[PDB]
Amino acid sequence: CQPHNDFEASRAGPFAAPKVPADITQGVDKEANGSVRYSYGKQHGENWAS
Amino acid sequence: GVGVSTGSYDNQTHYRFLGDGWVEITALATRLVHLNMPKSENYCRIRVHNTTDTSVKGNMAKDDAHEQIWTPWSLVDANAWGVWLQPSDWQYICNTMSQLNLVSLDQEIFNVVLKTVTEQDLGGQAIKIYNADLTACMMVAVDSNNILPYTPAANSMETLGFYPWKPTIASPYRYYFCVDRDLSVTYENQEGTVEHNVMGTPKGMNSQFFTIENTQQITLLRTGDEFATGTYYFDTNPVKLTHTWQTNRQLGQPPLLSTFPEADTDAGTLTAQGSRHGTTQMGVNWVSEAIRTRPAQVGFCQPHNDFEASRAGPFAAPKVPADITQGVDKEANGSVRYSYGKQHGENWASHGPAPERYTWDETSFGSGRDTKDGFIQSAPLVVPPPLNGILTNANPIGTKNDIHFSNVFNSYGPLTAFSHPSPVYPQGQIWDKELDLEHKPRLHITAPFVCKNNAPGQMLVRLGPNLTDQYDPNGATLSRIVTYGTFFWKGKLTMRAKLRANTTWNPVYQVSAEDNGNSYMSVTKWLPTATGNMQSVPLITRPVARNTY
Amino acid sequence: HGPAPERYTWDETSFGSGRDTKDGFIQSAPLVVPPPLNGILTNANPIGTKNDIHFSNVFNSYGPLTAFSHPSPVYPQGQIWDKELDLEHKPRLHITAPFV
Amino acid sequence: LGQPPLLSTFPEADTDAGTLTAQGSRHGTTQMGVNWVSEAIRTRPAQVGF
Amino acid sequence: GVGVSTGSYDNQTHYRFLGDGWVEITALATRLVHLNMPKSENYCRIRVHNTTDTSVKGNMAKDDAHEQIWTPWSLVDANAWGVWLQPSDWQYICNTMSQLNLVSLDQEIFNVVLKTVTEQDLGGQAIKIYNADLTACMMVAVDSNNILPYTPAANSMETLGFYPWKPTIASPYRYYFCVDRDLSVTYENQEGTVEHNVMGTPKGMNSQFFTIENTQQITLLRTGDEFATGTYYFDTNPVKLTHTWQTNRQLGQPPLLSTFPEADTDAGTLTAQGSRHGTTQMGVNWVSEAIRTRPAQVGFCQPHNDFEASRAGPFAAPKVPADITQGVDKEANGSVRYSYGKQHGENWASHGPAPERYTWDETSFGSGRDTKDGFIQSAPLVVPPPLNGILTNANPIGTKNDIHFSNVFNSYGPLTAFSHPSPVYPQGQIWDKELDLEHKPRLHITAPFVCKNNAPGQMLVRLGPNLTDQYDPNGATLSRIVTYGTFFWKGKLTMRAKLRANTTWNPVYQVSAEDNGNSYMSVTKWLPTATGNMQSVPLITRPVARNTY
Amino acid sequence: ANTTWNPVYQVSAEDNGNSYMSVTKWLPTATGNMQSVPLITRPVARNTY
Amino acid sequence: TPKGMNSQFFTIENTQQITLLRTGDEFATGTYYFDTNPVKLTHTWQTNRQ
């Protein structure tokens, strides 16, 4: 079990404490299991038509 | 025969540049020891159980309940950074070298002197006369096998003298014994007196009783004799002499700047948080310097004052020290506070039973925690933080207005990354024996260096019992002649270290000694007084900056 | 004779790593001798709208300083060796069998 | 673990026990900002059990 | 010259596994000795004849009538099991090893110290000052020829100290002399006072007078000198470290079972006693587990308290110890009782002239006797025991209601088979010199080990007489300067031993240390007190079971 | 090795009685029934420092 | 009742190397030698009288 969204703050400022990704199971808990979400561009993989 | 020295005095520090960036630093230290005939003729199993505090409902931490075994042997444990190097030297090392490790260590005992004191009435008074006793002899033993319980001299702050030109007394030897102590929990004024609070009786499964007489080869030496130990080698790993500023916030590639400052006043901007490349562990459609994924976790939230109890009794669960940050959370980050004496570093002018104390703050700015900013949010992470969809350090957790999540949260995970505790020059613990456990800790808070191999081996020492003319054990008549001893000690702690190079443009912070003033780095701090009093204050460890990525 | 098999509870011999829920507690950051009524969390404070669920039942003090021994293997019905898990980061040890 | 507190009092009989030094005025190392130490706040090499 | 040690302290025990089941055990022991200038300037022939008890008609055993020869020499006889090994060690040996024997033994005397004491008035009082005297010297002599009477230190319970960290005094030397003592027999209040009861005069056919001055090469050694003896070897046989349970009842093939138990409650049966194969020494036509012939005789009936008198006087005829059985017959089986002091094992807290005592009971369950069951039957052995055809332990034999056959019966025959007396860890006698007789005894009760070859050789020692300025033998003026001595002792008793193997399914009895409680095997028994007092209680010898057939 | 003065706890088999370390525990019965009960592991004491 | 100091329980299964042999198998032991002394095969008539 990993702390769901444990925002820890430091001298640099508040941040999201990383968490080892894992299966989502039937719980459909994505953000809870650490399922990373990406955001790329056109020169990185997005359709040039969009 | 007798009547001639058996050693040489040398308390310096030589630097041999082995090139390639590495330098071998040999630290020699010699001091005069003062040993008195132990009061305890034999091994005692004294049981100390303070009730002046344990009885009270409010007092819980002041539990000094334990049963030790006082032995008739002293101990010459010079495991202190200030008892080896010189005040000025440490400045050069920390400012130049970027890492250091222990290599070898030797010891020697020369000019052993044993004298007896007798009463002699002078004009009606009674002055003490001191006559040397050649036939007298002392006893030395170096348990390099560590068959006896390891007793760090720094753990009790009773090491040797940090002052070369000043003698020092060897701290008596004593180890803990098996005793089942139990203490109930009571807050302020709970209903009724404390429930349970009693000591324990010796068990047969944990009865650990050792004797210096049967755990080491005692070497008898008189006035003309001298002892010396082999060249022990350390297998400990080198400890970095630099601090880390980079926090979990700054690691990979910074956000692309869309706006460039026209003046030295204003700043630039980033890209559309909603429309910007990056990686976040949230299902949301936006990123920021707070949700962007990082290679690992810098530092971690530690349970604030987590007093765990065991068969031995309640105790404070140790916690890896770290930067205090702007939160000014000292006891929360584990900032260790010390308490030394005059023969350890306190000013000899400050007459009184009150010893000097200071709170050491880590330099690991990266693993710093801040309780005034820590919080959590509901699974469905949304920009607007609901009143119930967030847990700040102000929500009473457990029917308590002072007990929040921070005081009971362990963020230690497979991503936890931190530095080592910066060793202090004065009263600092150098090496330490590893625990005899299948899974020992990743590190020790007491001392940065941890002997992976066997331990150095504490050096025990006791004065030879000078019996009187009359003696009878069965009559409980242990008539002993008043006798003491003063032997010299010579040790060399050879250790190599590497020095960093100027890889930056902006001058890095250094450790300088400002003029005599309110400035902490005042010269008078380490300068003698009109009377001759002196004091040894902590030094800035890890002054140079270190990039953690 | 009977379908009821024999059972026994094995207790470790590691007196050093022993825990006691009847003594575990925490205190506020500003550590003061006199423990305030709200400046301490004993094993008697209902945590989570429950009178039987305290901090002890949900606290993991496992830290970089955690040091413990191995589970004493029993002579009867004791598991000797065991295969390691096919994982990047397998556990530091196994409870089923001392030998891995 | 480490060096036990220095005994200031020695038992005269096998019944009573000895004492320690002034908790407020005694050498040692504690992770608390307080001005006193004890067998409950003294720093240790590591953590035994958890 | 003088002013330097001449030896090393070491009181440990190393185990060298020679494989094949045999292990060489080397026991090193070092202690500090305290010798005082003997009061008797010369050899005395003191005659001790207690009449405070011998005169009485009832008292007969309290006959301490004898004439010894007090010599001005002490003796360093460390013939004790507790003065060699450590309390914990013995546990390991008895639990593992199944037999042990003595091999070699060496001794050494280093750090010889001799000081004199003088009176010095302090404020009207008179405190004693102690000044070392270099010119002073002691005298040592090891009679390896045994020309002098062998005087076991355990026979008088005056060996060396069993406590390493505690000094010890050497027991004075003295041997018996020829004297014809005679004592008549008197019961309670016999008619008239005791008939004869007088000491004797020196005879010319048994006058044995020896002198340490003419029976050994005295080696004079001062403060800077040191002595050492050769490596003496023992020729004694190994003693089993196990007990026997099998009695004369169980030996050969048990009776054939005709019935098999249906439940764990009931038992099986045998065959018709009248019609069953077997061998009995009776002319009867039936057999049983009481009349069946056996390979030999396990144990034997011994005369209970058979006081035999001789030219030297009445004495208690020794008797081989054995199991007490259910008869609880201690004094009847020969269970030896001891009486040691504080420097020998008694608690230092038990202040008083009353020494600790304990009755040792053998572990030879096989040779155990029971007076509450012993009996005899007429020649014509018949099932029905006639009132006159049997002699139970209740028939007044010799006009006495308390004197039966058991008190005066010696069943020692060519079939007598028994074990050896289990040696006790504390105050136990190790080796012993054999009697100079054509037919010496098959064994000794005092010590399990009996030197078949020559004896080790007691070590004598006396302080050198420090004469005064004035002296005159003819004027009976023996002015001696008050002087004492304190020399160290170092000995190594090397001995090999074999260990048994687990050849059974059911765990054999072992020697464990139960928690602090009423349990005899309590840890506190061997643990120091708040003051430092300690005691050494006997240990379970021969814990493992041994099959005798 | 014996590096202590006070005898360390051992595993012995007390006589037939209420004692857990009873011999009958590992001894056959009149019928032949037997049982195997757990044993005291790690009887010797170990110093962790 | 069974004592713990004299409890002697042995098992043929753990006290010797059992040799399994079927119908076509056969066993044989080594040549054991005796060290016993010879016994006279004659009687004595002479008594303490002659």
Numbering used by the authors:
A (entry chain A): 339 to 388
B (entry chain A), E (entry chain A): 39 to 587
C (entry chain A): 389 to 488
D (entry chain A): 289 to 338
F (entry chain A): 539 to 587
G (entry chain A): 239 to 288
Question: What does the primary publication say about this deposited structure?
Answer:
We have now determined the crystal structure at 3.8 Å resolution of the mutant N170A VP2-only capsid, and compared it with the crystal structure of the non-mutated VP2-only capsid (strain p). The N170A MVMp capsid crystallized in the rhombohedral space group R32. In the virion, the Nts have been externalized through the pores and, accordingly, electron density corresponding to the glycine tract is found inside the pores. For the N170A mutant capsid no density was observed within the pores, which indicates that the disordered VP2 Nts are not constitutively externalized. The structures of N170A and wt capsids are very similar but not identical. The root mean square deviation (RMSD) was 0.58 Å for equivalent Cα atoms in both structures (1.08 Å for all atoms in the 549 VP2 residues superimposed). In the ring of five N170/D171 residues located near the base of the β-cylinder that surrounds each capsid pore, the N170 amide group can form a hydrogen-bond with the carboxylic group of D171 of the neighboring VP2 subunit. This interprotein interaction cannot occur in the N170A capsid structure. In addition, removal of the amide groups of the five N170 residues generated five cavities around the pore walls. However, the free aperture of the pore at the tightest constriction formed by the ring of L172 residues immediately below the N170/D171 ring remained nearly unchanged, with a diameter of 7.9 Å in the N170A capsid compared to 8.2 Å in the wt capsid. The results reveal that the capsid-stiffening, cavity-creating N170A mutation neither modifies the diameter of the pore nor induces any dramatic conformational change around the pores; instead, it generates subtle rearrangements that propagate through the whole capsid, resulting in a more compact, less flexible structure.
